[PDB]
Symmetry: D3
Subunit: 217 residues, 6 copies
């Protein structure tokens, strides 16, 4: 009743039973009629107007990123290409945890609230062109968990890396895929799954490997 490492050993490191219970950790999303939701809407409008700036351009690009391209999207901040060909050890580490962070860490809350997404709410398109399950953001969770892991491998560039991971979430806000509160919530959950990953042997093996590789080149 839900994919995990025993169904897709290449996309997950953990089992359903090792997942963070996002439903119990996270407060509910702002309800329409609240001042907090009024803020989500205002942030949506701000993001919308940014769609035409340079920042909006980068946003449209980040919205194209599928789960698999997330790792490579940190090459600039990391300081070297994160590709299967230039760093297979590292590329393997980040790819096998994608759904631990994007799915297992968000599933519970995502399916209970079934929150509607901005574009669906306004019945308008997004900046780059599942109308529910908006809260919390799976992509943002993956983006942020990846940054935390990457920062441990290259502490010398933790700030650039952390910043990049943070902006990946904001791009979804600017592009209309999520409400601001959806991404803020995703960072709580995405940081939590990283703690669990550190208790997983396979993850630990790849981490050491990826670090050796890093020292290597």
């Amino acid at each position: 009743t839900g994919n995990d490492t025993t169904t897709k050993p290449d996309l997950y490191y953990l089992k359903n039973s090792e997942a963070i219970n996002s439903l119990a950790l996270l407060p509910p999303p702002p309800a329409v009629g609240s001042i907090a939701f009024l803020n989500d809407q205002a942030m949506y409008e701000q993001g919308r107007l940014l769609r035409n700036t340079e920042r909006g351009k980068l946003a449209a690009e980040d919205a194209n990123l599928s789960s698999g391209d997330v790792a490579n999207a940190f090459s600039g901040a990391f300081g070297s290409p994160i590709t299967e060909k230039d760093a297979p050890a590292l590329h393997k580490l980040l790819t096998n945890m994608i759904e631990d962070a994007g799915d297992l860490a968000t599933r519970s809350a995502k399916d209970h609230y079934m929150r509607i997404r901005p574009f669906a709410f306004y019945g308008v398109s997004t900046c780059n062109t599942s109308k529910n399950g908006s809260y919390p953001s799976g992509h943002t969770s993956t983006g942020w968990a990846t940054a935390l892991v990457l920062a441990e491998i290259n502490p010398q560039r933790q700030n650039e890396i952390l910043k990049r991971g943070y902006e990946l979430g904001q791009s979804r806000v600017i592009c209309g895929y999520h409400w601001q509160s959806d991404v803020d919530a995703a960072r709580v959950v995405g940081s939590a799954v990283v703690a669990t990953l550190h208790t997983n042997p396979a993850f630990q093996q790849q981490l050491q490997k990826a670090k050796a590789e890093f020292a290597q080149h």
Copy 2:
């Protein structure tokens, strides 16, 4: 500014290894914005909660000084986290207190010098008057939960939940605005990534895990 070279028992890192909170974090909600209007509403909600059972716990958490944070997780952890019952673990959590509470917040804290709720309303709390953004206490509470969860995964949810509530207590008690604690969790989770690159931290972590298995 203090760091491991000045208080080796409260910090693991050096000033140069600190997360630049000023450049990571967006600025706090400015008065006149809708976001701040929400911070105020959350302060009122917290105020009315002061009289409930949740408010009682809140007052208790507000008494926690940096040193008592570790022991405040005993219930969630499943066993007493004290120097006497778990010196290895108690040593691990205590030596990182300021890495999370100070280094990870300093930069943004000193630039914004945000006023605190009780100071803003000129009223007391449930238990300085600036440097409210982000919350140092919340950062320490959350960094500690992330570490503790790695040692005892079987109780990660109880632990993570307790750590999350430590922050909310400061909101209910009037020490911080909601946005102050939300910000603190971003920064607190970040300092944990750096700690994992520090040899001394790594030594104690292993030690604490061994002790736990014992």
Copy 3:
């Protein structure tokens, strides 16, 4: 089991089992953090600044009215003194329903939400200087139920009467005893209890009596 006609036959006409379930009828009160509550606060401030006007004076007076003085507070609008001495039949009718409207019709919701009152919320006094059970307003409910009944007796003055009853609630808002949403809710509930009263034999007896008296 709380008070009702079997414990205070002079303040109630109905039994606990005949009460309107306010908890199930009414939506919950505006939660702090919502736009609605922001409006309740704004109305509180408006009322506060009115405290110094003539309307504020009347407000302070209405806040002095205990459940028993409510009936007589309609004399002006009714067009004649509503007192035990000048109209005992009418005065008896209105008095015996006071808690049917002020208590039975509000109890359920009032005890579940235990909503804090404005003056308590701001830790300031009121204009006529219980801190919970604010939603819905028992007083407003009684005031409004009384107006509906009184209007049936003197249709020629229904508007003056209905208007006075409406203002009784607003005085509580201006004086700081209730949030606006507390009185709005009370009028739904107060009008409901009147439907039940019309099925009660004793009420019906006094109603006819009160009308006969009015004719004489």
Copy 4:
């Protein structure tokens, strides 16, 4: 200026016996106020409910014309309220429709000529573009429930609840702002006090009750 002297089957009262809604009711929330900001948020909430089960019921209630209102209480009442199964009762409720829906709202409705949600957003509804405040339908729905509750006290809560929800349906469906229906309940309850002073109404009430007892 219709009233009992023009449509004796839709009204019980005369223009001169009508509640002056304009003088009773406060004005509707003005755009630019916090109150209106709340009306809009409730509109959005109702909009998103349009796809749930509650939204389905809402669409159905929006189909109800003044004449179907009485029958819409059958479930809550506990028995079919139709001309064939309860002509006495069905006659009572039908002849008061415009006393509640028109006379008790007219004054304020024509003075404010408030725009409706769907017109405001230039979008369709879930099922006139002015005279939104107060809601005539809600007033009729609420006055009917108050009357029906007097006939069957044993089910006053189901009945009162149904009547309340008829109004909310118009909110969810986009026909009215929340403040429009809240106002309608004040006015709809008032007209019921007047009806109780009307002889014809009193005759039918007794008749309807007798019928209920026989039934």
Copy 5:
């Protein structure tokens, strides 16, 4: 840099160096996410619903006014036709200052903020079917500066005149060309350029001439 009296002596009295620094005088416009902007939006909605009333009709008419028709739009309030044929001295005065108020006094701030306009923001048309440079309003500045000048010529009708000038700005709000804060800002700037105009010799010459003319059309 841009146009001024040395490039279009018939639309400006002043030089770029004599311009009010609107960027340094004015506070920035309400940012989206602030309560102030929430108010700008509410006023936009109010104006939108007015589009169908009589006030909305006048609004649509005022939105047709190009910079050159502004002077004549005060004829009713002024009490007599302000046209080149009926009052060439006055008509010349008001026309030669159009860009001093509409451009020089707004340029700086207008180009820095490049504020989006309501109709563009909502992606809907206006009531009189550039998408930026909305803050402050050039038109409102010209409308208000003209009223201030006209009021000095005919003090007996200053209130009607000032009122008309004020309403020209509000029409843009009702019609969707500007946010309320854009026109409020314009009046600060428009009133300032009038102070400078009073130091300009050519302006002073025409002002006297226009007043003389005003005295003669009476008898």
Copy 6:
């Protein structure tokens, strides 16, 4: 209603020559409106500024009585505006004080009798204080009218001067004497009274005199 015929030294105009502020100005924001919500937020922002340097200047400007307004522009003007250093100029600005502070505000001020911030919050100010007649601000009107006049005399420093005049109004906001909308309204009315002043012979005489004096040095 005082005017030039009762205090020829404080006014240039007569009651009949006054701008009808009530008819020109829109009403002040009503409590319960979004606009008022903004006035309150600006009051809070000003309050927190009271402890900064800008707050210090604010407190000083709040001490300014109508008679000290002229001299408060010396720095911006570029030279001391005093009876001893520039009696012609000092006489010009002083005799118009109530034209701007009273005649141009009277009508609307007395009709709305708007409560002031400090009174509203029942707290003190930043500096026996009037509690109503807040809208529009008489002080701001005088401050702004003075700036407009002073800018005509010294165009070379119009921006410094206009800026100073604008800030005089903001000080009352920061200090709690007025709501933001009170000072915004005051600048419309203050600029209008300046148009009338230019039609007044006495004013015209002193203006020329003041300019001559300015050229003199």
